[PDB]
Design a protein around this ligand. Structure first.
Ligand SMILES: *[C@@H]1O[C@H](CO)[C@@H](O[C@@H]2O[C@H](CO)[C@@H](O)[C@H](O)[C@H]2NC(C)=O)[C@H](O)[C@H]1NC(C)=O
Ligand SMILES: *[C@@H]1O[C@H](CO)[C@@H](O[C@@H]2O[C@H](CO)[C@@H](O)[C@H](O)[C@H]2NC(C)=O)[C@H](O)[C@H]1NC(C)=O
Ligand SMILES: *[C@@H]1O[C@H](CO)[C@@H](O[C@@H]2O[C@H](CO)[C@@H](O)[C@H](O)[C@H]2NC(C)=O)[C@H](O)[C@H]1NC(C)=O
Ligand SMILES: *[C@@H]1O[C@H](CO)[C@@H](O)[C@H](O)[C@H]1NC(C)=O
Ligand SMILES: *[C@@H]1O[C@H](CO)[C@@H](O)[C@H](O)[C@H]1NC(C)=O
Ligand SMILES: *[C@@H]1O[C@H](CO)[C@@H](O)[C@H](O)[C@H]1NC(C)=O
Lengths: 509, 509, 509
């Protein structure tokens, strides 16, 4: 084989790629490394959320649970919940046929509560010479009973005196008060229970006042012909509520002191509750990631990645070290091994390949590569850590008569999602183009530094390599790599070689 | 004229550009081609929406149409609509003075419905020994009548027995049920129509119960001193609804079975309905386009481009091939004709211009240009195709009473629009700079490849051109354009010429 | 001092850099200038908003002011307001214990109104043989009185004939009408005041009708045991409204003609109202800026910069002229002085440094620098002026029972904010990288132009400098700087010097 000048080549050092990304301008570009921006893994279970357990309502509806249906678990010792899990077809709802007023609003505020305590508002004896109505519809502990939170006031010895009770909110926190009205199926039943004709209930704070008369007639709830209407008010501290009645009142007994509420979600039963903890709960499973996007499920709650309508987004970190880079004047070598291995983030090195009479081949340039690792790390950390906003679902709880606002809320959630989706896709494509170009610019700069050191002592082959015009042993090569090579040392030799080469003829002259 | 070396130039080949773009850093840059990102053309009419016709309500208001004002067209054979077109001053509203409860919600739910069927709920005979009220206010072509969907129950032989009727939703779908209450102007009229003292109506499902008494007094509607209140409920499959009255009930006769509703819009009359079809209806006209932005009208429905507050957005595809590029070391030639014509997307070529003793001299480099074409194609398709979310208006139907929520909804639509508008403008400016610089980079790389091929056989004149230091005929030039030129072949000749040129002096030494 | 060639260097001329920015890939990069994109300065006061003063409600609540509590300032002379400032603990509310129906919505429509005129709807005389009730609860300068806007109709000589009154909106404008119902604590008081048994009030337009009976019982408002309910309706032009009562009506007297409403905000008292004018009012103070972002306060109103969750965002405008640019082959000179001083936007010049026998050595290149200034100016103006949307807070006024919708509105505001916050942070980082790189490319292009002019008459030292191979006095230097230098003029001399330099041996042959 013909004799050739010693050579040094500046460019990429890595293994085979096996990892593609897309850029704005090209698909399936092999790169030495990338990271995934989109989380696709989840627990497939309901978990505790940042250390706070949800409440699974089991076989009860929210209304049944909050009003104290005795078929439902008592909330006497509950202190908090991060969210609720409910069976849309729970058999235990209101045990006596009736309805809860403004119940969508109620569901929204109780979707999560960070601090919750049940409290006795008014003791039963306060109402005076009255008896407590119980019913087989609301059995508890083997006997006819009633909702835990309410007292059904009925006559004693065929008399119903005007009953009065009041509660002052001195808790320093908000207090949910529940009360109700029983509406008899017949005037006969109204007279029997309440004695007084046209009985009334008056409920007032300092800010509002409501009066309630009986609405008599037959209803179609299971097991009873009469009906109950349940009402509620959230008292701010300092508020005062009064109750007066001559028949029909379902008196408040227990209520709820709350702080930091409306913080959760009502998820649907089916997916199973597990002993696990995550920072983001979705209807599909819990998510524990530091990624800032997820494509798993739009219905999400907590410290969440933003839901996007997308597949995986691979963000380029490493090199575009492919066979065709020589077409753009660049050099790259593929190796399976290098002393110390490849650096983690970029996989791995800017560096040199040399060839002289003592052999080949490669060595990394640590300084430039470290500069590059610093740049890519800074870019990644900016793209990720600046997403420090609130990215869970834009969402509320609504009842069945609240279709329009429910649709609007869901549409806004979807539109915000469309914005983040497009932006994330385009950002990844654009930045991949930029990252790969930046690596190129970096090795080109290194190449120009070497060019500048060698000056007239080398021929620029235009492919990332220099043919050195003098013998350059491993020690000389090392002076080139560590930036101590002085071209003056080899000027004479190099000029002679240059002259020699100028005279050579492929076809003899 | 003095003798000159043969020469080859590398750069842009195009015709004179006529259209301009803006970039983030420069105004009115002439380029060889661009595409428009914003649709400005529409039909100026109301059209079918993705194959589904709207309903023009003509001389009727929505309330008149839905309750069955006998002066409005019957919806007996209606099966679907994509949207509604309504005259705000339609003469045919509620024919008998009255009001529809929660009618903004009703309008929202019925703004579009993809499956619709009128259905008889309760047969009139079910109400028993009663008669049906008719009135000159709601005439059927000259005959006193009433709303098609309701029955005005009145006394028969001066008796009104308790009436009762019920409907079970067995349809497997949602059913809209309408009923009403007639409130007499006087006690005399109450007694005359309904006979019974203190007439009541009771309507209940298993979920809720409402009781209605008469509210007696003179109203100011046209043609009547009394008043009607109309109520509705949307029944889910399996619900059941019951009605009882001793006077006042406007009994349900027809209801509507509906599927996939709340999908439309109530547009205003004026713009004409035409035989045409479109992916996206606006209040100005229909849009058929593959562009992903429009600046025509914010009130838009369907498979729509995103509305933006912007003029046209021209996305550069072609070259910046202008006289001043020489200042940046770039070469360009302007020709009215080539051969095979110019490429459609970029209009048109990276290539060569040559000059030798045989003549001159233009030819395209197909590989590099096609690479650029694939690049631009990929960019455009990325920008456009990734906008695959939902971009019609964020909007609802609201009545006069719900101004606050109407305003908030409109503001959120406007904020989403502001985000898209700013992002679109900036994306186009930035990407235009990038595209133009990309073409430049591509022809520079071409130039460097030729420079590498020629080596010491040519002088780089820093303007995209190489002066060749040897005779280079058309065969030679073609070896240069096709990558087969071997510099060794001409070494002896080029070194002679170089000596020669090196010895020339403008002013004799 | 060995002999050295004359030299010219092309690159940056500036003073020492006192200012740093961050880029997407690097923190704390010193640049010669930047601008702030985020406003952080404000007045700390409530100001006029675009020429329109707010109203400070002082000692009164909105409700007490709007219904005309005689303890509050009369609005008889008010013509407009941009926003309201209210004390949540304002002592003057409803002077006679009661409530305003739908007061969240009313607050929202009256948050700001651009044209306002109180108007007398119906004279007191119209209600007939009635008297006007007064109370010590609502005093006017010690005199028992009542709300300005209403008349408390009570018996005259123990008769209360049916009272009637009407108002036709013929103003071409929207008209707010207020009315109320007084609800006695006892039947005794009802009979005393109103005489008639079961008194009723009927209020109707052609669009709706409401009937009101008395709700008797004790309430807990200060200083009275009875209760008042206040209602309102905003009449559109052409509307008509009627009032009839046999007892209980608080009859409308004064209403409000309004145009362009719902435009303001109800801010909280505390921050002082000052004599100043701004185009954007926040709860913290007024903002007067051309910046398009603010990080002061999310509760903002008017022609506002967009609130973002961010620190300051510094946009690079100037040069990266640091000691280390030589590593990338770039030249830079630090000077405190230059004739003409440094240009404002970039601080300041692309230029030349020269060295010859006469001395040294700096001069600006005006053409290239002015080109750069035009580029940066154009970029900044695009980034700023394209942000011409509506960026004040997305919010509404809501009462205490409207928690869910309030929370949802606030969450949408927050999500829009999160979008702009991220986008602004990333835009600045990316564009800073691009700006610094653009300055570099500009000076490299100048460098290449000079290189092209010098041809073989200079050695490119790789550091932005050329060692000129012939003597090059100030005149010659100036021909290099103004582009008239002809390399042919110096060919002989240059070749001789090159040969000399070639033959020299730092280390002897
Ligand atoms: C709720 O708070 C109110 C206000 O403090 C209490 O009413 C007062 O009770 C005190 C003590 O008997 C009386 O001296 C005052 O005259 C009352 N003020 C008024 C205006 O009623 C009330 O007792 C508290 N209720 C409960 C159940 O604790
Ligand atoms: C509506 O559905 C109910 C079912 O709940 C029907 O009422 C039942 O009628 C059947 C005979 O048809 C009786 O055996 C059941 O005891 C009834 N159930 C209850 C709980 O009342 C009712 O007949 C249906 N009405 C219509 C209009 O079809
Ligand atoms: C409000 O408008 C109505 C309708 O125009 C007025 O009623 C008319 O008034 C004239 C003068 O008395 C009568 O001749 C008409 O017969 C009335 N028309 C009807 C249908 O009632 C009414 O007077 C106006 N009221 C006020 C206070 O301006
Ligand atoms: C660089 O290389 C030479 C030969 O390996 C070595 O002797 C010298 O100390 C090195 N210089 C520096 C500063 O690394
Ligand atoms: C390139 O040009 C030469 C001379 O015209 C021709 O003979 C040769 O076949 C060409 N080579 C290729 C690869 O097209
Ligand atoms: C450039 O510089 C030379 C020397 O000062 C001067 O004579 C000449 O007029 C200048 N040319 C132009 C075009 O400004």
């Amino acid at each position: 084989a013909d004799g050739i000048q010693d050579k040094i080549c500046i460019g990429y050092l890595s293994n085979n790629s096996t990892d593609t990304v897309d850029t704005l301008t090209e698909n399936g570009v092999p790169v030495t490394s990338s990271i995934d921006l989109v989380e696709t893994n989840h627990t497939g279970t309901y978990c505790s959320l940042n250390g706070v357990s949800p409440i699974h309502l089991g076989d009860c509806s929210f209304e049944g649970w909050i009003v104290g249906n005795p078929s439902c678990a008592s909330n006497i010792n509950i202190r908090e919940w991060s969210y609720l899990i409910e069976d849309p077809n729970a058999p235990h709802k209101l045990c006596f046929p009736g309805e809860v007023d403004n119940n969508g609003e109620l569901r929204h505020l109780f979707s999560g509560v960070n601090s919750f305590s049940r409290t006795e508002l008014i003791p039963p004896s306060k109402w005076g010479d009255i008896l407590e109505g119980t019913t087989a519809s609301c059995q508890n502990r083997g006997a006819n009973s009633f909702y835990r939170n309410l007292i059904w006031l009925v006559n004693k010895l065929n008399k119903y005196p005007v009953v009065k009770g009041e509660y002052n909110n001195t808790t320093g926190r908000d207090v949910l008060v529940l009360w109700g009205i029983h509406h008899p199926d017949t005037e006969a039943t109204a007279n029997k229970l309440y004695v007084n004709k046209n009985p009334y209930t008056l409920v007032s704070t300092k800010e509002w006042s409501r009066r309630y008369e009986l609405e008599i007639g037959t209803r179609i709830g299971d097991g009873q012909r009469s009906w109950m209407k349940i009402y509620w008010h959230l008292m701010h501290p300092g508020e005062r509520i009064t109750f007066e009645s001559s028949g029909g009142l379902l008196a408040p007994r227990y209520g709820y002191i709350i702080e930091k509420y409306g913080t959760g979600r009502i998820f649907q039963s089916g997916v199973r509750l597990a002993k696990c903890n995550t920072k983001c709960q979705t209807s599909m499973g819990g998510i524990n990631t530091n990624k800032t996007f997820q494509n798993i499920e739009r219905n999400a709650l907590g410290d969440c990645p933003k839901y996007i309508k997308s597949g995986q987004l691979k963000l380029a970190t490493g090199l575009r070290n492919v066979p065709s880079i020589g077409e753009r004047g660049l050099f790259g070598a593929i190796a399976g091994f290098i002393e110390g291995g490849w650096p983690g983030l970029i996989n791995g090195w800017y560096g040199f390949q040399h060839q002289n009479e003592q052999g080949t081949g490669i060595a990394a340039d640590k300084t430039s590569t470290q500069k590059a690792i610093n740049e890519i790390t800074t870019k990644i950390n900016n793209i990720i850590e600046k997403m420090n906003g609130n990215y869970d679902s834009i969402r509320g709880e609504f009842n069945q008569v609240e279709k329009r606002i429910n649709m609007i809320a869901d549409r806004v959630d979807d539109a915000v999602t469309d914005i983040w989706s497009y932006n994330a896709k385009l950002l990844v494509l654009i930045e991949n183009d930029r990252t790969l170009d930046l690596h190129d610019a970096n090795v080109r700069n290194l190449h120009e530094q070497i060019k500048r050191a060698l000056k007239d002592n080398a021929i620029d082959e235009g492919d990332g390599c220099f043919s050195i015009l003098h013998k350059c042993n491993d020690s000389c090569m090392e002076t080139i790599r560590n930036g101590t090579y002085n071209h003056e040392d080899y000027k004479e030799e190099s000029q002679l070689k240059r002259q020699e080469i100028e005279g050579i003829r492929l076809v003899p002259r």
